[PDB]
Design a protein around this ligand. Structure first.
Ligand code: MG
Length: 664
């Protein structure tokens, strides 16, 4: 069914992937790298005290606060979803090997019984109606760029100035580029404007993963994580093998002389890709407006901020079902990519822009180092984008693509299993648009609050309600997959976008509340993904600019968790036995310190002023900028804080740009 070409770094096709500069050349040869993460200025994640602290706290919390999750996966009581062993990993040390990314997922979908394309005309109308509601009345906006950020594949530059340049030149030439593509001149478009090429794979860590304490042996066991080797990846699973990567860790001892206490492991690594900025810029100029519209006009189902921005919605429902989807990104269907491009064309949209968009979701992938001595290889031929890897993490609109699939998948799941009486409202595009529009505004008996693969499906009073309870029981039996498009089930310990839905004895949304997941605070504070980077001066270009500020917002964020205080105590205690020190004291100092420094950045903060006029979200963000990529967005944060992390291209230039792509 097609092996997918593969080229080594020495091949010319791989070489054209990196400009003739130092960073690019080094990015193409970066070999496997491993090392203890600097959890806080001065403390290494593998510091024997810290590990010790981790052992005591992970066992104490597990033992004093076992999880309260009923069989329908609702959490109640203490608000704990599972044990606390997740923190038992030697952070900056990965499982081995990381997976190779699958070149084609068509077979993965088939063997999992997911469909080829819409299974019925209704579904086809819906997916399509979504594209119309989402791409119709866009308003230009400044193109925003993250300060840390790399241009990726062609130049691997991080200088804002150069980024602004590339972006602007990209909005000017985006059109000759897409036309060259429309005639199949991918190489030209890439050589002349750096649009095309490949995504650059980088393996990111998942600091915490899931460890189990076997009672039969009293020894811990990690959740096996399957990964594909080269053969497996280039043949879509037809050949090669799929296996469990080793999270062992014991090797850290012979290799680095590092002490690995019992029951600690290498953290899992998930593939992540950076696309070529020249191609993403044309795409982000469309995606930011689209986000804007769906967070405004359809704010009901798509825009979420505070734990209470959520309860307001879930509280009205008579039955809330919290879903979970398996492997969202690698199962995401190319046929949806094609359906979407098709609709956009039908609605107007410059065909050169659509060509650009389709191509960004089919680009080759270049892998750096999934493991020691392994592959610096290009999967896919840039001359003819062919990959069907299913949704790249660095494509300009990953969140949009995922939200659009799914949002509709849940709808279909609701219409299919509970509201057949709604089917007659979807007869043609107009009625579909009219229905979907009504549905996302929360005006129907079936509702939804969702973001990519995280959702909360809802039912008010009505005919749909009795079905719904069936859907739910269907999910609890886990025997039949409820959708034709993605493998869906219920989340064991339902939560939406960080927050857990805490149910009382009643077991009904109406009397349930949304609290913060205490487990998260733990992950955040004792297993960050990245170290604090004292190495970099400009704290804005640091993965974790002001780790200290989190303390100023903990309360607001995790306060309602039933065990909040008990946890802070366990920490103070366990921390004391490992450092003869006071965490808190430790944290307050860090708070003062970053608070003070923060002021050198917010050019509007009276030098030694305080955190006075800042959002709890502002704090969490300045302490951890990812989140601006998966929880919140530009408008959720104050503007004074925004400039500290972002910079942009003139609204003027995007507007000129949008005019030429927009239908009207
Ligand atoms: Mg969830």
């Amino acid at each position: 069914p097609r092996r997918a070409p593969a080229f080594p770094l020495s091949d010319i096709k791989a070489q054209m992937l990196f400009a003739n500069n130092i960073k690019a050349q080094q990015a193409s040869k970066r070999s496997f790298k491993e090392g203890a993460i600097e959890t806080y200025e001065g403390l290494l994640s593998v510091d024997p005290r810290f590990l010790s602290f981790k052992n005591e706290l992970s066992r104490y919390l597990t033992d004093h606060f076992p999880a309260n999750v009923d069989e329908y996966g609702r959490v109640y009581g203490n608000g704990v979803r599972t044990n606390f062993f997740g923190m038992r990993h030697m952070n900056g040390f990965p499982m081995i090997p990381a997976t190779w990314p699958l070149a084609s997922n068509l077979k993965k979908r088939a063997d999992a019984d997911l469909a080829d394309g819409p299974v019925s005309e209704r579904d086809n109308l819906l997916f399509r109606a979504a594209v119309r509601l989402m791409f119709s009345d866009l308003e230009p906006v400044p193109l925003k760029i993250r300060k840390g950020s790399s241009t990726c594949i062609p130049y691997f530059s991080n200088d804002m100035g150069t980024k602004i340049e590339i972006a602007e030149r990209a909005l000017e030439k985006a059109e000759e580029a897409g036309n060259l593509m429309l005639q199949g001149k991918f190489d030209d478009a890439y050589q002349l404007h750096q649009m095309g090429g490949a995504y650059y794979v980088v393996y990111r860590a998942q600091s915490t993963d899931a460890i189990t304490l076997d009672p039969k042996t009293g020894k811990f066991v990690s959740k096996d994580r399957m990964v594909a080797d080269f053969e497996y990846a280039v043949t879509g699973g037809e050949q090669g093998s799929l296996f469990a990567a080793s999270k062992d860790a014991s090797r850290l001892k012979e290799q680095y002389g590092i002490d690995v206490p019992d029951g600690f492991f290498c953290e899992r690594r998930r593939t992540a890709m950076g696309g070529p900025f020249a191609l993403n810029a044309p795409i982000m100029a469309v995606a930011q407006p689209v986000r804007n519209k769906i967070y405004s006009k359809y704010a009901y189902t798509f825009h979420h901020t505070t734990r209470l921005n959520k309860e307001e919605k879930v509280k009205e429902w008579s039955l809330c079902v919290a879903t979970d989807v398996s492997d969202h990104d690698t199962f995401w269907p190319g046929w949806l990519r094609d359906l979407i491009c098709d609709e956009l064309l039908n609605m107007g949209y410059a065909p050169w822009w659509v060509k650009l968009f389709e191509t960004s979701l089919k680009l080759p992938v270049y892998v750096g180092a999934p493991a020691p001595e392994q592959g610096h290889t290009l999967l896919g031929d840039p001359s003819n984008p062919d990959l069907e890897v299913g949704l790249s993490s660095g494509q300009g609109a990953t969140d949009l693509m995922g939200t659009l699939l799914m949002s509709i998948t849940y709808l279909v799941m609701q219409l299919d299993h509970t509201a057949p009486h709604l089917n007659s409202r979807i007869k043609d595009m107009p009625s579909a648009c009219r229905f979907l529009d009504s549905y996302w505004q929360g005006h129907e008996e079936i509702r939804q609050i969702s973001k990519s693969d995280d959702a909360m499906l809802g039912w008010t009073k009505g005919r749909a309600l009795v079905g719904g309870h069936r859907l739910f029981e269907m999910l609890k039996e886990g025997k039949v997959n409820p959708s034709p498009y993605m493998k869906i089930s219920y989340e064991h310990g339902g939560a939406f976008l960080g927050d857990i839905l805490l149910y009382d004895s009643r077991r009904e949304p109406g009397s349930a509340i949304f609290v913060g997941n205490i487990n998260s605070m733990l992950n955040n504070q004792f297993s960050p993904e990245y170290g604090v980077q004292s190495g970099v001066r400009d704290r804005s270009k640091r993965k974790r600019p002001f780790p200290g500020l989190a303390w100023a917002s903990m309360k607001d964020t995790y306060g309602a968790c039933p065990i909040y205080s008990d946890v802070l105590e366990a920490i103070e205690r366990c921390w004391w036995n490992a450092f003869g020190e006071s965490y808190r004291a430790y944290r307050e100092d860090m708070l003062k310190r970053d608070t003070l420094e923060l002021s050198r950045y917010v050019a509007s903060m009276a030098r030694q002023a305080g955190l006075a006029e800042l959002t709890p979200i502002d704090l969490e963000v300045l302490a951890d900028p990812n989140k601006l990529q998966y929880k919140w967005t530009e408008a959720d944060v104050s503007a004074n804080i925004h400039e500290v992390l972002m910079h942009g291209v003139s609204v003027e230039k995007t507007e000129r740009f949008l005019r030429s792509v927009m239908p009207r």
